[PDB]
Design a protein around this nucleic acid. Sequence first.
RNA 1: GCAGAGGCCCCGGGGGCGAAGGCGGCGCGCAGGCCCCGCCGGACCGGCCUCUGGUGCAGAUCUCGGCAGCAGUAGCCGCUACUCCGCGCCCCGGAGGACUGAGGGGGAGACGGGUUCCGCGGCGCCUGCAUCUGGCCGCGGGUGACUCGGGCCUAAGCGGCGG
RNA 2: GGCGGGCCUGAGGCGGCGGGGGCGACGGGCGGAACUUAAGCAUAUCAGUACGCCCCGGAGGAGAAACCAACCGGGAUUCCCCGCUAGCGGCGAGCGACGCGGGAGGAGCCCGCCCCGAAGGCGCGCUGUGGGGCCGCGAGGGGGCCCGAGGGCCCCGCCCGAGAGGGUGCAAGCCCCGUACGGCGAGUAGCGCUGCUUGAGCGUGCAGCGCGAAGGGAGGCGCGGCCCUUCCAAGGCUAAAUACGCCCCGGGACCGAUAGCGGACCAAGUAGCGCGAGCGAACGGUGAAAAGGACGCCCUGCGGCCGCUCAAAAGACCUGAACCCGGCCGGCCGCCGGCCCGCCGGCCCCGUCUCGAAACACGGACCGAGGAG
RNA 3: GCACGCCCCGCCGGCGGAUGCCUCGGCCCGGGCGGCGACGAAGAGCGCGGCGGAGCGCGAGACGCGGUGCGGACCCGCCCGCCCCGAGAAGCACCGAUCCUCGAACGCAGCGCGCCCCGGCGCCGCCGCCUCGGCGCCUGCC
Lengths: 133, 88, 117, 50, 120
Amino acid sequence: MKLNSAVTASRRKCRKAYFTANAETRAKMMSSRLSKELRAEHKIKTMPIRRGDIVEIFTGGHKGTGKVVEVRRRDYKICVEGINQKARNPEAKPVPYPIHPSNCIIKELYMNGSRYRAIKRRQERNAERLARI
Amino acid sequence: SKGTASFGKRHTRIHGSCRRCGKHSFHLQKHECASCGYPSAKMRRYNWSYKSLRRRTQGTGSMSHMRKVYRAYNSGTLKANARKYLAK
Amino acid sequence: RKIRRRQTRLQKAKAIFPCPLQKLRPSVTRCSQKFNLTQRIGRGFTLRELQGVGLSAGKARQIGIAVDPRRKNKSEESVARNVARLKEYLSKVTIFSKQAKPEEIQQAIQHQGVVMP
Amino acid sequence: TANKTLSRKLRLAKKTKTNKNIPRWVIAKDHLKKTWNYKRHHWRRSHLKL
Amino acid sequence: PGLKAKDLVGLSQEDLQRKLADLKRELLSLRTMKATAGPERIARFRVCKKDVARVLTVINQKARDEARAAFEGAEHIPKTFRPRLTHAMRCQLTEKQKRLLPSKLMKRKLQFPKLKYAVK
RNA sequence: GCAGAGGCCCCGGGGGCGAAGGCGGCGCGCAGGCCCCGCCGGACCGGCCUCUGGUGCAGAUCUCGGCAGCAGUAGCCGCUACUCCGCGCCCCGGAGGACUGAGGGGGAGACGGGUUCCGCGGCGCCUGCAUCUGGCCGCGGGUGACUCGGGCCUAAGCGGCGG
RNA sequence: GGCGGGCCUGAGGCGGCGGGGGCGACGGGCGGAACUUAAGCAUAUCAGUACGCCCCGGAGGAGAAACCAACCGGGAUUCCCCGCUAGCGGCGAGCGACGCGGGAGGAGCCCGCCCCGAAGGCGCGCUGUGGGGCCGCGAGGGGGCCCGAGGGCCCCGCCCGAGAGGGUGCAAGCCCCGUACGGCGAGUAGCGCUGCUUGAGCGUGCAGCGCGAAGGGAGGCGCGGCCCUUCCAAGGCUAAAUACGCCCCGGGACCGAUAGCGGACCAAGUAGCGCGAGCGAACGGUGAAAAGGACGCCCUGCGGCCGCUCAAAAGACCUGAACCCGGCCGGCCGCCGGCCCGCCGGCCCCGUCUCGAAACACGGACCGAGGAG
RNA sequence: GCACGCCCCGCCGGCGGAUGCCUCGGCCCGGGCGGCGACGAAGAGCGCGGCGGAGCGCGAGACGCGGUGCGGACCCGCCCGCCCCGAGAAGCACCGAUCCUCGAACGCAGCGCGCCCCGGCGCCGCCGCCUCGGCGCCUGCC
């Protein structure tokens, strides 16, 4: 259970905090599972979703793999290239079907440099925890 | 001619905007504000109306300075205070 | 309120870790012919009682004995009661000085509750 | 009224520039669903400064 | 895209004063253009407005730094440079004044110092 | 019977193989009420035991919200008034016939309203019939002073003054 | 009479520093009601309340006995538990303390007076200065079937110092976030007269005016003696335990949109109203994703029609009741009973006061929600 | 008789917003703080966004600016602007400034008018200081 009083366990307080959260917190909330292959390489269970990430949806209808073309933190959803609603008119511009990032597994990551620096900081912090704190 | 004709002979501005409270409460003839109380230094607050006090008081505006200084007291305003008490 | 008073009490205890929170107070006959048989704790030891042990009021306060100049013993038996209480406390008290003596201070054990109840 | 005061004119002027509709692009950006200002006044019915 | 304050920090006040006038003439030009034209998104307009602010922050910071140094270690210093404090903190007795005790009282404190003690 | 609380619901109560709710139809109960079926609906809901209460409505010139019949009813009876033609709307243009009748249904100011003024586009509202009209709606504009007025000075008055 | 200085009172100017005003609570000071209760109404009660004014502070006030008591005695103040009754009151209605005892918390002091006499804070002062909290990491789930989509089911597993929660296309310990586990003493006392007040009663405290001490105060029935216990007023400070709103944080056997704050709605003290003081609303919900409507047919055109998207139109919105109304179909009809079912028989309109209501008594158009031991 | 009006054997459709279900809101009880102001508060007015009305937020340096420590890709429309082991989107904590008109409100008014040598120019105290006034107390003179 929770032994800390500072964190709220109220449904009302929790939903308001998620529904209206700062963008820094929206990022962590919008994390996604690193693949078995990536996890072995980087030693991090889940990394926050980015706009160059290629991800494989594993539950929702539309279970394919694509790059993340757009991230809309306000809608708490990400848009994956190639997963769209059926464009009624054939000669029409596609509308992306937003997928939640929980429903996805990160096949590839946009390596960047800050991503690499962030991956390392966790690797040493997790090592302190693995050293039984 | 008690009502309509009497209301038709109205074309005057008894009340005017207040300097301090920006309301149509400043009597032009008496030179006093019905709500603001200006030109009195102290403001007009009467505990007969809870609602009137709530309509204009602290928290009914930007609270600019107070907010900024209250935030500082949960930060380094208190360290500055300690330094002054001891030497400077 | 109960948790608050304990927390204030715990904080105060640490500030004077060797010293007991409560000062020594005197046994005093409870007032009135109703309770004249029993004894309770009073504000402070009379100057005569402290003189009987041989402690000045200021020296006594440092040891931990509260001093009340106002109180008058009203008896010779009352003085004997308190002088004996003062004598026992003097034996129970240990003065830790010698600048810092941390090893002795670590095992000092703070007395808890009213002293000599 | 043609003999007005600059201070009175300034407060009346703000009301004229403020009595405007929600910009259509604002409705689109915030997804308003309530496109009526409700703070918009009309010279025939509304009495400003009353 | 606006002049980094790091670059203005590294300048002379006369160059900063000249730069501000040029930005202000540009600000007039953008204002004339936007009104005359019937739009290009006027992206420089927004950037210029921030870069008239950036340059003037630098010019204040230089002036405050020069003035504060002149008014230093002197009784009676310009109020703006005075410690922030608060109205009540400014008016509160110094801790040395609050601790100030009568000579007879101090003599007793020395005569009977705090003693550390423990009881069974 | 209601709405919560603590338990139970013998592999751990009932639910997208359709919850609550609504609509009709049985069945049980002296009745308060319950149950099941069909249909809609679309995610929650109970039975028993113990506990709690802001716990059951035909009324109170009850409160609030909806809305019926009267009823296509009463009425749209001030200011003498319109007509023809143009493509023609009650708008506009020409031609007639009127009217307000210089204490004007004229032209202007003080006040009060505060942009209503103007030009262009439109009618979704409003114009209590209509509208292509408009004081309505959208857009873009419009108030220039050495001599006019404020300011100025005093009037009734009002403040201010060692106190 | 003119003229220079010192003092003592006063002016004008400059500096340095402070004061002013704000907060619907708590805290102090003052002014101060009435409705009410007394089954009337004056004293009383309400109530030392509302309200008016004036000051603080994080607390404020109070505070180290001119104390209580009557003893095999205590010993500053504040808050708590008890005492609940001693008393007071048209002795009516009502009102009403404290002292013991148990606790929280405890801390003591300083001036004048007097001794020195500038030793001082030295432009002053001998008309006396000075001394005596942040920053983190963070476990472990698959297959089958189906569903618009599992977080559903059916089999098997894994992590619990984590099965508190929230999100995610349905009900998720293992999908995401988190959680458990971390790190860094004199115009006075008194007294006379008045007034207010108090439980205080021949005075509980205060105040005016008059008069005014010296060893005085008190001990709850006045006065004059005699004691006995107890204390030292007319100067000052003082922490703690206690109170409490805005604001922030957390929890709830709380309310669920006519409720809960007036206000759950990007714009509520808002829109509006009153010359003004002041008053004061209404308004929650599409869907998982706007995918917010493909096309064609026509129409002078509007608009219609198909259909489309979607699990569904859920189409300006969840469910969509009652009242009320339009089509189409079916009957001739209020209720109760018998029957095949339109005939016979019986039925006044409720509620409510009232001796008595169908009453030419009163309230009631209708329906929904709210509504009172 | 038909129509009407009723009633409904049922079948659809309006009109309304009840009922459920939900819920970033209230209320309730604890904590915790106790932190405004002439260095200009509380409040008020006017402005400020590339497209900009309300609200929020700012103040002509305006829908923000500088510094530091984090953070690391966005920015609800259209943008244009970023994107890169640092290059720096959203976000966050602090700190330094700017801060129009009113307002205790401060040259005088309230939106108009002075003074003054350029700094400014309100009141009330306290303490020094400067210029002085007195047939107050005297002293020195003539």
